[PDB]
Design a protein around this nucleic acid. Structure first.
Ligand SMILES: [Zn+2]
Lengths: 308, 200, 207, 81, 68, 154, 143, 30, 206
RNA sequence: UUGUUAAAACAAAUAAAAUAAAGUAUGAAUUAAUAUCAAAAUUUUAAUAAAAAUUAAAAAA
RNA sequence: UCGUCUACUUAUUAGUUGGGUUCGUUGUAAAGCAGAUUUGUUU
């Protein structure tokens, strides 16, 4: 037992922490949208992703290949605009996670366009482990990238992806796997000499427009809090996308509705009609859109040039 | 098509902005406190370096009531209506703003408690002091306690006449910070209550 | 409640009485059960008749030795088996206050009502469902008995701790180790499958 | 502040002489409106002491008591008479 | 914490709630002699309420607190 | 379930005189907008439908038909209401100033405390989050069951 | 430095409770009550608590332009005879509005008249249960 | 309900050059 | 009606002087898990533990944890398991905690608990081994894939068909040719079915 | 007052009333450089200065 | 010393379509530049 004054002090500070964290109210600003964990520690990046074009170019010039991680629901809006603007000489492998919910037709269209451009699209499901993904990445490296000059050197892949998409989870999984096998970078397979290099700030989007935030909250990337962004702004956009699709009978069959709804108020009242208030009803609708019982959905549009 | 469901949410919110700016013309004049008024005249001379203007200091508090349409709006709106949350939140915000303007007055006003449901006349500043949670209202409370200690420390016998059981009981009845029946600090503006009942 | 809150640790004789009662509680239950079964098998005074006698406040339904039984069990041997509520006790007082013919008439009416209630008790009403979901117990005499037993246990173990310990001291707790690992999981501390672990590190991760 | 003894049961046609007291239960206190409370361990203990004291007083026609028990005993004997 | 052992012992041993009226002490005397359903139970002797002035030895002997 | 022209005519005629309009139209409009009309008072239906036509802001219809009058009549009704509130408040003032102590309670009690609203909201949110966790765990268990069989060794 | 809180001054410490006997104070109370009666601010009443408890009453509070009328049920009468003390406990319900008032007699701007000295304890119990249920509902909705 | 056709046209919403497409920073600066 | 009767039994025991037992509470928890009404089971568990002074049993804890898991409250089950303390050790509670830690966020924690109980305690069975192998499949470490087989051999406890199939899959992933071929031969000798993907992979390798 | 549940119950914690815990005898222990010990303000000398000096006047239990 | 800079440009037409991508006031030449700047024997 240490000093009693120190015991009293730690008791007092723990009680203060408890009385500070007892409040269930969540603050407006999404801390997750700006925090980004790395090897040095938790970092907060400010600014958009356009003013970092040369900082991205100087690193994609050093890296051997470009491993990007995006979400299949909204491919283009999650990533880097300068990567799509300026052509990257290095081969790119784009892993679309949560591919079970995206439109199969849009998935084949985007993978066809990536094959036409020179990139390789890999769609990963929840049942698939990261081992098959990293094995396919190794196969891509040994099939596309040329042989290194010196035998001891390794090929580097710059990882571009938001921490909500699964980049941080993949990094942690590979790190723990390597640590358990042996007991700023991350080695995956030592026989082909493949290593990965992460860039937190270049992938952290930071600020976003209204519709961008709507799409991110509908996909589950950005958090949702009552002070900053009510559920109405996102659920009405979801229903507007569903109405632009025009599948009213399909909405009814999915939500177990007596008839095809006419308006958003009608949708809310019909979901309310188990009994629950409109707020939790809209929360359950958004949760349905998150879990993905509604399938073959793509919120991000495709430009004319990518559709050609 | 277009953003029908999005524009409908924006249209209803624009209506709430207009019907609440309309209710501003229905006001109830409340004369400010004597000590608080001199505190605004003092802070104005140091800020603007000029004598205070009778139209800027506003010795009469302009409190705004909730619009007559809004109370009957949430009334006939079913709980299953999605548009009830956006108008309920609009009323909860105005219900607190009304408290913020009410605490600046010191004239006698009807205040009922919610514990034993007793209606009594109280002064809004001293009654709603613990609920409003304003630092300037906290700093003036600490300032007046020192001002009383300065007078009592200069003359100890001054406490005998000023602070007596006859004087202390009289001042508590003059500023009923709690209900004389249930002794509860929780209270409500009766004017806002009767405005909500006869319309709902 | 006051004794359990501000109870000075008992002496030798009080400890002995508490231990004796706690040890012979089972013998007391066995002997009251034996008295009751002897009564119902040799005299035919069934629990229905015993409850009727309880409600009418009549001792003719019991033989002579019932009132001669030990006082510690004389009151339980008669009306301990059959179920009784605080409402039933209040109704017994009301009957005892009311006249005898009204006693019998209202008791027969209430007995018919209770039999119909028992027939209808197949399902649960909304109030009973709410009480079962909440956890509130209207008939908390079992709770009072268990709380008295726990208070006796505490007042007896406060004298000699090694006398009535809950878990053996020398025996290690694999379930406690599993709960330790589950606390690691709860706090999110990375467990690399390497046993043992560091409790100071778990506490640091917790804070 | 309020005495539940004022709640009258089985009221008679004519109002009682006291109409507010028991009158045996004295509601001992220190203000002049009440009886002097002799030091006891509880109000129940005080009532038990008063009961035994007035019983012995009625039994043996005299009682020698110390402290504030004498005025209480005298007033209770008055109420008994 | 400052709670006196003797005083707390007396408070926890004996009751404090005083009677309110003679009708109330009568109702209490009625409701006291009631059997315990599942409790421990206490001996209800045939002279528990009867006058103990002739039973107990010290109820007539000279007393100082009662003054003979 | 309402024609556009019929809804426009109803919204235009409710400001002037809604008595001549049939009440079945108002009933079905309340059904559409998910309104609550009292079944024991026929005036409640017309009051609800006129206040809902008030709170509804047709960007083109009202602005073209009556820019000033459509809010003007509603402002007149609001002036009537605020004068009624002033009268009732003065009545409460005089009765509380004359009587010794006065108590007032409402059976409907149309008033909700702010902290109570927040607590109910977070409570229903926690229940919905528990059900969301149920769904998530079911999905993860199904994914594990699929990976235990479909995954082939390289 | 130093001050004194108590004063042993003779004029302050002397009392007159012994000489209060030569003042007919109860007669002064009755004279004030009779003056109020003759002025019309109150009207003499002789009923008992159980008799008046549960009797309908109508009270008009005079107020320009319209005096406010209120019909309620007497819940408690504080005095059995007329006096300057008085006190009546009325309970009145409007459309979805319950209220419990304590009417003092002798107010000129307040005219309360009980429609019948006789009362119905059954209706009294009904009103009492209604008021208690309303109060409990209000407290439960508050907390 | 999983493989049902749900396609979104590009002319219904999210027009190019809109205040919703542009972030609030640029609009406030302008 | 079955749920109503299940709650009525406990209400009747509460009304009477008797008290329900740990097996009754476990069966009631399984009933609530079947009925998808977990708040009732949790309220009954609280009422049994905090004021009724009924010590928790191994089967009772395993039943309540299995109910939480089946309803899908894996995090709440983890919390309750962390709160658990002073309960006898049994293979049922062991495999239930293994399921809980498998479905939890950290699949390595159940492996750590198994290595902790490996020194002493109840002997693990084929179900526990299947749970360990499923957790290894979910996580992806597989570093002790042959260690599990060595432990089973030294424990001298037979394995089930699913156990042997998961072990075959683990060995094929860990490219242990000799051990995989030996296990395939002994599986064909025992005449126990295998997974279709594993059989196709074996036939393509041969 | 807060929190939980349900369309009132439970747990916490203090601030008002109420209850007790002597004015009788019995009677220790920590401590102890000391003038019948320097009430206060100002200034100053080697670190709180209760060390010095200048104003001033600080009653007893 | 708390400054500002998510669009210019090259073409195209009448909103559509492909390429490329900071400035500056004042002090100072050390009196300027990492990080900390807290203490009630208090219950
Ligand atoms: Zn009150």
């Amino acid at each position: 037992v240490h000093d009693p004054v120190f015991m009293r002090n730690v008791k007092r500070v723990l009680a203060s922490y408890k009385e500070s964290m007892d409040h269930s109210s969540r603050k407006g600003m999404s801390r997750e949208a700006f925090v980004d964990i790395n090897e040095k520690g938790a970092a907060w990046y400010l600014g958009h992703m356009q003013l970092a074009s040369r900082t991205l170019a100087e690193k994609v010039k050093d890296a051997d290949f470009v491993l990007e991680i995006r979400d299949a629901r909204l491919p283009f809006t999650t990533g880097n605009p300068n990567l799509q603007k300026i052509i990257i000489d290095r081969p790119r492998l784009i892993v679309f996670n949560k591919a079970e919910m995206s439109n199969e037709d849009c998935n084949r269209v985007i993978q066809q366009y990536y094959e036409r451009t020179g990139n390789f699209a890999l769609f990963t499901s929840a049942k698939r482990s990261w081992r098959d993904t990293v094995e396919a990445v190794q196969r891509f490296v040994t099939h596309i990238l040329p042989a290194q000059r010196f035998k001891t050197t390794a090929n580097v892949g710059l990882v571009v992806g938001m921490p909500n998409v699964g980049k941080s989870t993949l990094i942690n999984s590979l790190r723990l796997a390597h640590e358990y096998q042996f007991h700023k970078l991350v080695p995956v397979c030592k026989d082909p000499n493949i290593v990965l290099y992460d860039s937190p700030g270049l992938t952290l989007p930071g600020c976003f427009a209204k519709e961008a935030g709507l799409k991110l909250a509908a996909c589950g990337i950005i958090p949702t809090n009552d002070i900053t962004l009510p559920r109405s702004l996102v659920a009405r956009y979801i229903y507007d996308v569903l109405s632009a699709a025009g599948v009213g009978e399909h909405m009814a069959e999915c939500l177990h509705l007596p008839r095809a709804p006419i308006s958003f108020d009608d949708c809310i009242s019909m979901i309310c009609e188990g009994n629950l208030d409109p707020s939790r009803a809209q929360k359950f609708l958004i949760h349905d859109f998150q879990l993905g019982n509604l399938g073959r959905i793509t919120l991000d549009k495709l430009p004319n040039k990518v559709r050609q | 098509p277009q953003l029908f469901s999005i524009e409908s949410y924006e249209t209803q919110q624009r209506a709430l902005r207009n019907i609440f700016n309309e209710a501003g013309r229905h006001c109830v004049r409340l004369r400010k406190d004597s000590k608080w008024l001199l505190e605004e005249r003092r802070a104005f001379r140091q800020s603007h370096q000029r004598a205070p203007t009778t139209k800027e200091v506003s010795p009469h508090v302009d409190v705004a009531l909730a619009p007559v349409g809004a109370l009957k709006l949430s009334k006939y709106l079913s709980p299953c209506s999605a548009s009830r949350e956006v108008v309920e939140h609009s009323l909860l915000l105005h219900r607190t703003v009304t408290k913020s303007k009410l605490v600046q007055s010191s004239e006698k006003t009807l205040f009922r408690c919610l514990r034993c449901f007793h209606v009594y006349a109280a002064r809004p500043r001293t009654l709603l002091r613990g609920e409003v949670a304003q630092s300037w209202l906290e700093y003036e409370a600490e300032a007046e306690k020192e001002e009383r200690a300065r007078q009592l420390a200069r003359r100890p016998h001054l406490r005998k006449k000023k602070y007596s059981i006859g004087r202390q009981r009289a001042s508590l009845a003059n500023d009923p910070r709690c209900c004389p029946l249930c002794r509860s600090t929780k209270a409500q503006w009766m004017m806002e209550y009767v405005h909500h009942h006869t319309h709902g | 409640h006051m004794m359990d809150k501000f109870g000075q640790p008992v002496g030798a004789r009080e400890f002995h009485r508490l231990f004796k009662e706690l040890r012979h509680a089972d013998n007391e239950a066995e002997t009251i059960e034996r008295h009751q079964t002897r009564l119902v098998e040799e005299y035919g005074v069934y629990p229905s008749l015993r409850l009727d006698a309880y409600m009418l406040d009549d001792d003719t339904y019991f033989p002579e030795w019932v009132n001669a039984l030990p006082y510690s069990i004389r009151d339980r041997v008669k009306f301990g088996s059959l179920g009784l509520t605080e409402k039933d006790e209040a109704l017994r007082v009301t009957l005892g206050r009311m006249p005898l013919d009204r006693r019998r008439r209202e008791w027969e009416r209430l007995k018919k009502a209770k039999e119909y209630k028992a027939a209808k008790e197949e399902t649960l009403t909304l109030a009973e469902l709410r009480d079962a979901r909440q956890g509130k117990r209207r008939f908390h005499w079992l709770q009072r008995k268990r709380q008295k037993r726990a208070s006796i246990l505490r007042r007896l173990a406060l004298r000699k701790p090694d006398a009535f310990e809950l878990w053996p001291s020398r025996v290690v707790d694999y379930s406690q180790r599993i709960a330790f690992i589950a606390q690691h999981v709860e706090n999110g501390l990375d467990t690399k499958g390497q046993w043992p672990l560091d409790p100071e590190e778990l506490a640091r991760a917790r804070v | 502040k309020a005495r539940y003894a004022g709640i009258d049961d089985n009221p008679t046609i004519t109002y009682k002489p006291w109409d507010t007291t028991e009158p045996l239960m004295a509601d001992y206190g220190w203000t002049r409106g009440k009886l002097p409370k002799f030091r006891a361990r509880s109000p129940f203990h005080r009532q038990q002491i008063a009961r035994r004291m007035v019983t012995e007083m009625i039994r043996k026609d005299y009682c020698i008591v110390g402290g504030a028990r004498a005025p209480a005993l005298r007033i209770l004997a008055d109420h008994v008479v | 914490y400052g709670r006196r052992y003797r005083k707390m012992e007396t408070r926890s041993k004996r009751r404090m709630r005083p009677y309110a009226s003679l009708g109330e002490i009568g109702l209490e005397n009625e409701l006291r002699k009631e059997p315990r359903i599942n409790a421990k139970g206490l001996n209800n002797t045939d002279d528990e309420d009867w006058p103990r002035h002739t039973k107990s030895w010290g109820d007539g002997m000279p007393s100082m607190r009662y003054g003979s | 379930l309402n024609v556009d022209e019929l809804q426009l005519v109803r919204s235009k005629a409710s400001t002037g005189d809604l008595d001549e309009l049939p009440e079945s139209l108002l009933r079905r409009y309340a059904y559409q907008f998910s309104l609550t009309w009292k079944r024991r008072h026929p005036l409640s239906l017309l009051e609800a439908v006129q206040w809902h036509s008030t709170t509804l802001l047709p960007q083109q219809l009202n602005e073209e038909g009556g820019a000033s009058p459509t809010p003007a009549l509603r402002r007149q009704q609001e002036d009537e209401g605020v004068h009624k509130t002033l009268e009732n408040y003065e009545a409460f003032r005089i009765i509380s100033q004359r009587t010794n102590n006065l108590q007032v309670v409402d059976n409907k009690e149309i008033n909700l405390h702010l902290k109570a609203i927040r607590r109910e909201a977070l409570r229903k949110e926690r229940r919905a989050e528990e059900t969301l966790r149920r769904e998530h765990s079911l999905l993860e268990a199904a994914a594990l069951a699929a990976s235990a069989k479909s995954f082939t060794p390289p | 430095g130093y001050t004194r809180e108590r004063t042993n001054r003779h004029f302050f410490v002397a009392r007159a409770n012994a000489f209060f006997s030569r003042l007919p104070i109860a007669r002064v109370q009755r004279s004030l009550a009779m003056e109020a009666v003759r002025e019309g601010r109150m009207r003499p009443w002789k009923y008992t608590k159980e008799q008046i408890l549960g009797a309908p009453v109508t009270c008009n509070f005079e107020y320009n332009p319209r005096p406010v009328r209120l019909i309620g049920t007497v819940m408690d009468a504080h005095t059995e005879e007329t006096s300057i003390k008085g006190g009546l406990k009325v309970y009145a319900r409007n459309e979805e509005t319950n209220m419990m008032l304590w009417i003092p007699p002798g107010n000129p701007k307040l005219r309360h008249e009980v429609t019948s000295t006789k009362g119905s304890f059954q209706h009294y119990l009904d009103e009492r249960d209604k008021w208690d249920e309303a109060w409990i509902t209000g407290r439960a909705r508050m907390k | 309900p999983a493989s049902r056709n749900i396609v979104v046209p590009d002319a219904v919403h999210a027009k190019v050059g809109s205040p919703d497409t542009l972030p609030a920073e640029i609009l406030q600066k302008r | 009606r079955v749920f109503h009767l299940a709650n009525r039994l406990l209400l009747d025991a509460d009304k009477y002087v008797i008290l329900p037992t740990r097996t009754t509470y476990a069966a009631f928890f399984t009933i609530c898990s079947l009925h998808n009404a977990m708040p009732f089971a949790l309220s009954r568990f609280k009422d049994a533990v905090v004021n009724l002074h009924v010590a928790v049993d191994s089967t009772m804890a395993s039943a309540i944890l299995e109910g939480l898991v089946q309803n899908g409250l894996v995090e709440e089950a983890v919390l309750l398991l962390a709160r658990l303390q002073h309960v006898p050790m049994d293979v049922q509670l062991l495999n239930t905690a293994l399921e809980v830690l498998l479905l939890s966020k950290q699949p390595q924690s159940c492996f750590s608990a198994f290595e902790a109980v490996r020194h002493s305690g109840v002997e693990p069975t084929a179900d526990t081994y299947t749970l360990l192998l499923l957790a290894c499949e979910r996580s992806g470490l597989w570093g002790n894939t042959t260690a599990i087989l060595a432990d089973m051999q030294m424990r001298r406890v037979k394995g089930d068909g699913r156990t042997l199939n998961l072990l075959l899959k683990g060995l094929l992933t860990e490219r242990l040719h000799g051990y995989s071929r030996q296990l395939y031969e002994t599986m064909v000798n025992k005449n126990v079915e295998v997974w279709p993907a594993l059989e196709s992979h074996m036939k393509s390798r041969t």
